[PDB]
Amino acid sequence: RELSCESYPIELRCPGTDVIMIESANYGRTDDKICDSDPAQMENIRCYLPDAYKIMSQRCNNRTQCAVVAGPDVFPDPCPGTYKYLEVQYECVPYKVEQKVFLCPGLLKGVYQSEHLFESDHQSGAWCKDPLQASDKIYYMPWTPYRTDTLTEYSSKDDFIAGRPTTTYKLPHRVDGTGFVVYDGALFFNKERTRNIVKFDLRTRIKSGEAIIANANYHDTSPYRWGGKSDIDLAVDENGLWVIYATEQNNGKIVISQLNPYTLRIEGTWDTAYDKRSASNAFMICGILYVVKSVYEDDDNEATGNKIDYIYNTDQSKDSLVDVPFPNSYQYIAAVDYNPRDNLLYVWNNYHVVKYSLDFGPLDG
Amino acid sequence: LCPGLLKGVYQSEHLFESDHQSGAWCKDPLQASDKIYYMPWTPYRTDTLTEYSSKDDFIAGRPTTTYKLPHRVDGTGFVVYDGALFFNKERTRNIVKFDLRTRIKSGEAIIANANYHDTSPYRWGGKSDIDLAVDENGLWVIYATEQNNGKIVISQLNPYTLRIEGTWDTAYDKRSASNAFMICGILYVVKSVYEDDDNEATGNKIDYIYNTDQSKDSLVDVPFPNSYQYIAAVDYNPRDNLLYVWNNYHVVKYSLDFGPLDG
Amino acid sequence: SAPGTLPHFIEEPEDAYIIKSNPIALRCKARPAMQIFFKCNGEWVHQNEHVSEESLDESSGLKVREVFINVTRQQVEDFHGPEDYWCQCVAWSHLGTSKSRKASVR
Amino acid sequence: CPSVCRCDRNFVYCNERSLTSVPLGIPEGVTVLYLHNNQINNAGFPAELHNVQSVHTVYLYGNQLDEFPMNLPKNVRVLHLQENNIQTISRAALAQLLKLEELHLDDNSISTVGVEDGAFREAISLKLLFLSKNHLSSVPVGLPVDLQELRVDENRIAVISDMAFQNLTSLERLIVDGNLLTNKGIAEGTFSHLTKLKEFSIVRNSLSHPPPDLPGTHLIRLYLQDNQINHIPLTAFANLRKLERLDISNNQLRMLTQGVFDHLSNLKQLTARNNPWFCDCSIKWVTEWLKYIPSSLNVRGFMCQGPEQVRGMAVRELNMNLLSCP
Ligand SMILES: [Ca+2]
Ligand SMILES: [Ca+2]
Ligand code: NA
Ligand code: NA
C-alpha cells in the first residue's frame, strides 16, 4: 500500500514486468493522525472521493511504473480548508490488456445510413447513449430557443420509438445548443449566455462543477451553419472527453481541447484551419476531428455538401483535406455525436431521429 | 419441506423507519434463533454488519454486537447461512464467506463471467449486480453475464466448498428487474415503479418465473405490494416462509400465499 | 421639502471568511432606503433570511435602513459554481435602485 | 471594414476587443453585428450605425451601459442587451427601432421608475420581450398590444395591478417566477383578460392559494411550485377545460376538496413531489380517482406524511380499505 500527503506526487512500481492493479483508492481523510500540518484542518475526518478509483485506473493500470501528482491537477477537491491524503491499495498481476472496447478501430473511410427511429416534434435536437456504463439507456434533449432545461431518460430502444419515458431530470441552468453529451452517469451540458460547461450527476440530481472554456465564443457568436446557439459541441471518443468550440484569436476557426471529466480543466489546446460557421457539425474519433459539410433548407445557387472535407489529428498536430460521403436524406442537420462502445453516429436531421453506421481502414498509424 | 408455488404477496409487519434510503435485513434460517442481521447501505462505505437479539430490540434500537468486515460490500445482496455471512466484495465478482462465531474470513469464490460494480444491477442500481438468495434447495447466486446479453443468470453455490453446482440462463434483463428471490429452486422476478419517476404509473407485479429442475420459463401476473417506491432488496426465508423487503427508508416484512400447483 | 435621490451606501459589504464552521453574517447600510435585499451568485435571497433594522441616524436627515444575512459553511461547500461565493446588495428608492460591492465568502 | 475589428463574410466581430465605442467602418451588406463582452458605454454610439439598414441582429451583452442605446440600426428585429447595467429606458430610443420584434434585457438594473411611460409601446412590432433578473418592483404599464411572449421573472415583484395587463390580449406565454408575490398583491381578475394565454408559471413565490379568475380559453400549462398553498378552491380550476399540464408540487397542502379536477378533461399530467399530505377520510377520493384513471393522464407526487402508522406510504394504493374509515 502507498500513501502521500497533499500537493505531493505518489510513486507506484511493480517488480520485473508486472502491472499495477488498483483495489481501493480514497482521496481524503479517514484518520487524523496521518498528516502533520495544522489541527484546524484535521478537525473533519469525514472526507471521501468516490471518483478516486476511476482516476487512478486510467493511469496506474496496464503500466509498470506510474507517478500521479496528488493535487488539484489530477484529483478534484471534495471539501475546502482540509488537508488531504491518498490511500491506494494495489496488487502485482501480469501484463494482459483488454481489447476492442478501449482500442482504436482505424482511420474513417465511409459514413453510411443505419437506423431510422421516430420523426420527433422538435426540428433541432440531440440524443446520446452513455458509453462508459454498460446499459441500454437513451438520453433525449429536444432543443427549443431560450427554453431548453429538461433531459429525458429512456429504458430501452423500444421505449424510445413508442414514446415511453423513464424519468425527466430538471436542469437548473438553461441549455445553449445541441452540443450535449453524457460521461459516466453525468451530463456535460453547456450553459446559456456563457462559455461554461455545467457538470450534472444524474444519480444525485445535483450540480457538481462548472468549467470556464478560455476565450470561447458563446450564444450565437460562432455556432455551426444552421446556428441555434451551437457555439460549443461535446464529443466523446477512445481518448476521453473533448470540447469543440471557436475563438476570435483563431479568427472564428474551430478550436478543439481535451477536458478532464473529474477536475474540469483543459489538458491541451489545438487550433484548426476550418471555420465553425462553414461547418455543419463535428465529431471526435481517437483524437481525430471530423468536420461535416452539408446542404441545408433555403440555399441560393448551392448544392455542395453532404461530405467530410476536413480532418485534424491531436497526437500528430497535422491537418489534411478528405472527401468522405456523409448521408443527407434531410437538409436541416442539428447534432452529430460519436460513441466508442457501439462505434455508431447519433445524428438529429430535420425532425427525424436517425443512427449512422461507420466504416474504417486497415491502418491508422 | 416444499410449501408449493407462490400465488400472492401481501403486507404483514411494519417495524421502523431507518435513516438510510437503501439496505437489507435477514434472519438465519438454519439456526433456530430469533437473531436479526441488519445491513445499512451507503455508497463506497459499506463494511459493517449489525446483530440484534430479538424482534423487540430491533424496533427500539438495541444492538447486540457489530462485526467488522475485512472488505467493502457492494450492492444490497446480503444473506446469512448457518452462522456465516455471505457477501459480494466491492469492485470484484467475488462470494466472500465470513464466519460470525470465529470473526475471521473462511473463503472467497469467483463467480464466472459475472458483471460487477454498476455494470448489470437492478432498476435503482446501487452496485446490486450480485444478489444472494436462500430457499429449500440451499444457497443461490442471482447475477448477470454478457454472454446472456445482460439477462439474469442463476447458479447454485455450495456454502462449504464455495463452487458452482449448475448454471441457468433466463430471458429477463436484470436492469429491467427490481428484485429477485428463490423459493424451491424457482426464480421470482419483481417489476416495480421507483421514486423521481413521475412519468411512470404502471402497476408493480411479478411477471417472470424460471424453474431449475424443469429448465422452463413462464410469464405470470402476481400483484406485489408497494407502499413506498424505493424497493432496495427482497430476500426469502424458508423457515418462516416470509419476505424481507426494504422499501425506501422503512423496513417491512411480507406475508406469502402458497398453492398446490406443482409437479 | 425633503430631497429625493438614489440610494447611497454607507456600509458596503466586506469579504467574509469562514473559520471553524462558525457562520458569519454580512453588513449593509443605504440611504435613502425603504427595501434592502441581497442577490447571492446571480439570484435573489428569500425574505425570511433578511433581518431588517430601520435605525434613523442622528447625523443623516433621510431614512437609514440596515439588513443582515447569515452565510453558513454548508452553503459554501455545497456551492459548485465557477467563481467564489460572491454576495451583492440592491437598495430601493422613489427614483431608482443602486448596487454595492461584491463581497466574496471563502 | 474596421482595423481593430475583424469581419467575416456577412458578419462583423467586435466582441472581446476592449472597445469603448462602436467602430466607424461598417459595411452596407452585413446582416448580424457582434459587439458583446466589451467596455462600450451609452455615450459611445455613432449615429452612422442607424443608417445601416441591412443589419437585423445586434449583440451587446456583458458591456458597461447605463441607458437604452441610441442610434441603433433602423431595420433590426432581434437585439441582445443582457448582463450589463441599464437603469433607464426611454420612449425616443425605441421609436427609432420600429421593426424590433425580439428584445433581451437580462441581469440588468432595470427599475419600475426608470422606464418611461409607454417606452415599450413605441416599438409596435415587439412580440418577444425579456426583463429577467432585473430590479422591477412591479409590472410596467406601457406594454405592447401585439406582445406575444412577456418574460419578467427573478425580480422583486410583490404587487400586480389590473391595468398592467391591459391590451395584452395577444399574449401567449407569461413568466413571473422567482418573485415576492402574494395573493394580496394580485388584483381581482388581472389575468382574466388574456384569452390567448397558453402558458402561465409562478414558481418559487409566496402564494397562499392559486390566483382566482384565470383564462381557460387557450391555457395548456399551469405551473405552481415552491409556493405556500394551504388549500385549493373549487372555482380556481373550473372553466380551465383546455388545460393539459398542471403542477402543484413543493407546496404546503394537507387535503384537497373533492371535485377540484372535475373540469380538467384535457389534462395529460399532474404533479403534486414533496407535500405534507395528512391522510385521513379526505384522501379516499384521491385513491379511487388514481385507480380508474385513463393511461393518457399521469398523476404522481401523492405520498402520506401523517399519521405515523401510514407515514411515507403511497396514496395510489389502500391497505385494509383505508382501515375503519368506511
Ligand atoms: Ca458532436
Ligand atoms: Ca433479492
Ligand atoms: Na453533441
Ligand atoms: Na441476499
Residue numbers in the entry:
A (entry chain C): 100 to 464
B (entry chain D): 202 to 464
C (entry chain A): 46 to 151
D (entry chain B): 36 to 361
What is written in the article reporting this PDB entry?
Here we focus on three structurally distinct cell surface receptors: the fibronectin-leucine-rich transmembrane (FLRT) proteins, the Latrophilins (ADGRL, Lphn, Lec) and the uncoordinated-5 (Unc5 and Unc-5) receptors. Most protein–protein interactions shown for FLRT involve the LRR domain, which promotes cell adhesion via interaction with itself (homophilic)2 or with Latrophilin7, and triggers cell repulsion by binding Unc5 receptors. We find that while FLRT2–Latrophilin3 and FLRT2–Unc5D complexes consist of 1:1 dimers, complexes of FLRT2, Unc5D and Latrophilin3 ectodomains form large assemblies containing two copies of Latrophilin3 for each copy of FLRT2 and Unc5D. Taken together, our data reveal unexpected structural versatility for the interaction between three different types of cell surface receptors: the homophilic adhesion molecule FLRT; the repulsive guidance receptor Unc5; and the adhesion GPCR Latrophilin.
Each asymmetric unit contains three such 1:1:2 ‘tetramers'. Within each tetramer, Unc5DIg is bound to FLRT2LRR in the same orientation as the 1:1 complex structure we solved previously (root mean squared deviation is 0.7 Å for 423 aligned Cα atoms). The Olf domain of one Lphn3Lec–Olf molecule (Lphn3ALec–Olf) occupies a binding site on the concave surface of FLRT2LRR, which has previously been identified as the FLRT2 dimerization surface. The Olf domain of the second copy of Lphn3Lec–Olf (labelled Lphn3BLec–Olf) makes extensive contacts with the Olf and Lec domains of Lphn3ALec–Olf and inserts a negatively charged loop (S393-N405) into a cleft formed by FLRT2LRR and Lphn3ALec–Olf. The lectin domain of Lphn3BLec–Olf makes no contacts with the complex and its electron density is not visible in the map.
